[PDB]
Symmetry: D2
């Protein structure tokens, strides 16, 4: 097995751990949100063809959003968000409350969720996010990234 | 796009170029041979699951072989073979006449084909072959490799 | 030119930009601090031999510290700190107020400086910090990292 | 420790092993030759500045050559040569008899030495030679390469 620089998890130890692994790039990101981030799944690029990563779906009735990147001219240049406990859960471990994505083309996708708690910011000067890692219970407990050149 | 160190092609400019891309590792290699190498296709590992790469099948009635590696404890440590023209074709053009694979566990698979022509040898001290690239017409004209850590 | 995954800068646009480049690893880190981080320089490993990176020295009369890692068994597992403006300066741009280093061996070096402002945290699950990048004026305005496998 | 894809050695087990390690690129290559390759040393690029690698000098009275690449627009695209025993020596083990270097700019540097024995060829489609490894006794017994993106 090859390996990739893996950075992060930002968030808490709750939920179940998952790792989608590494691919060639990112085409589309799908997440649900309200006061925190619920569902999270992505459509990766695998050597030129779209490839659906495993779904990390949340049952909560949250609003869905689809982030379509203009692969391969456009790619994530930074990932940022907020982690903190959430009040509505039984629950006391930190969870990803908010997520914000910035592109090399200057596009910004939201702040989805409540911008409340402790802040995390991953600005990328050189390199590509090539896969996601994280934890999901009823919501998105933690998020992590795999990177390559 | 991520990229990988791509080394080679060994062989001639004949046939049609193909690139299977990059993956997480190699599970199984299938090739056909007689006096030269005909068919070539591989089952890669993609983040823990087997993944069938495109088939680069030859129509010649050659003998088929299946090389099953004990992924992930066992992996290719070296690739070697012979390149040279092949009388039976009218072509020219050099083609892969022979292939030999050595494993980190000490297993050697063949010499498949005629050990005739100009020799090529890729001994790997550190790193993993993570995908194949090459050219196929009626037979395997050339072969190349993608590598990662 | 080879390149490395370069992540961040955390901090402000003040001072002058510098990039020490990439090496084989990190042996020793030298910084000065008080209410903010002043000086910053490192002794890298270059293929087995110690190598002094350029000095990014601050003139402020701050307390000096030397962080000696037990290379190569011990290496940085995470970098974290605080960024915010600093009253005592004439310029209003954010500066690195605090820095904290955690090792794979479980050693934690400080919080050096004032743990005041906006927090940044870089937990590393796989990979190695292999060089630093940043900005220095009278103090350490920003800090960034180069990474490899 | 960071690591690099290391491919090779081509040649025999004679002499003493050496590894110059990894750098940012290659600026200049110095070798001596006659019927085989004698001396071998290189001036690497280390983050923009020239850096002399260890000398692997041969005492034989061979002809010296200096290969100056136009770093960083020009870089090695392939390394090839011949390995075989050499009568003039007392020891019977294979040695590097010949070396040939090709540039991305289309320049070819020699065939230095006797093009006699078993051939080796490393064509690079993507990636950079970033360091050399090998064995030296009275002559160059073996040669290997470190690669990066
Ligand atoms: O046996 C469990 C637990 O059940 C009760 O809690 C139920 C659920 O309440 C929800 O609010 C939420 O807290 C759930 O927790 C999951 O999801 C979160 C967020 O993804 C994650 O942090 C957790 O680890 C869980 O995977 C709960 O399951 C109560 O009866 C309680 O006392 C009891 O321990
Ligand atoms: O010399 C012109 C400069 O004079 C005044 O600044 C003097 C210095 O005041 C210190 O407090 C500090 O602000 C210095 O600034 C540098 O260092 C900080 C921190 O590293 C950095 O953010 C800045 O970009 C500077 O490199 C000042 O030099 C002011 O009147 C100022 O406006 C004037 O330019
Ligand atoms: O000193 C002892 C040595 O004597 C005879 O060898 C002397 C040398 O003869 C040379 O011509 C050559 O074979 C040397 O070998 C070195 O260099 C080669 C080429 O780089 C390398 O392959 C070898 O490993 C050596 O480093 C000899 O040193 C023989 O009787 C010999 O067996 C004895 O050791
Ligand atoms: O593959 C061997 C040979 O097969 C056919 O003759 C053609 O496709 C050639 O271009 C190719 O070189």
């Amino acid at each position: 097995a090859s390996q990739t620089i893996t950075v992060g998890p930002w968030g808490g130890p709750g939920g179940n751990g998952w790792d989608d692994g590494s691919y060639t790039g990112i085409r589309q990101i799908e997440l649900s949100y309200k006061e925190a981030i619920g569902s999270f799944s992505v459509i990766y690029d695998l050597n030129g063809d779209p490839f659906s990563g495993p779904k990390h779906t949340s049952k909560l009735p949250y609003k869905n959003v689809k982030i379509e990147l203009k692969f391969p001219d456009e790619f994530l240049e930074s990932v940022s968000g907020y982690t903190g406990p959430f009040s509505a859960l039984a629950t006391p471990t930190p969870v990803v409350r908010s997520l914000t994505f910035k592109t090399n083309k200057g596009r910004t996708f939201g702040p989805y969720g409540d911008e409340e708690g402790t802040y995390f910011n991953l600005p990328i000067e050189n390199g590509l996010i090539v896969g996601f890692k994280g934890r999901t219970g009823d919501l998105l407990d933690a998020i992590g990234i795999h990177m390559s050149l």
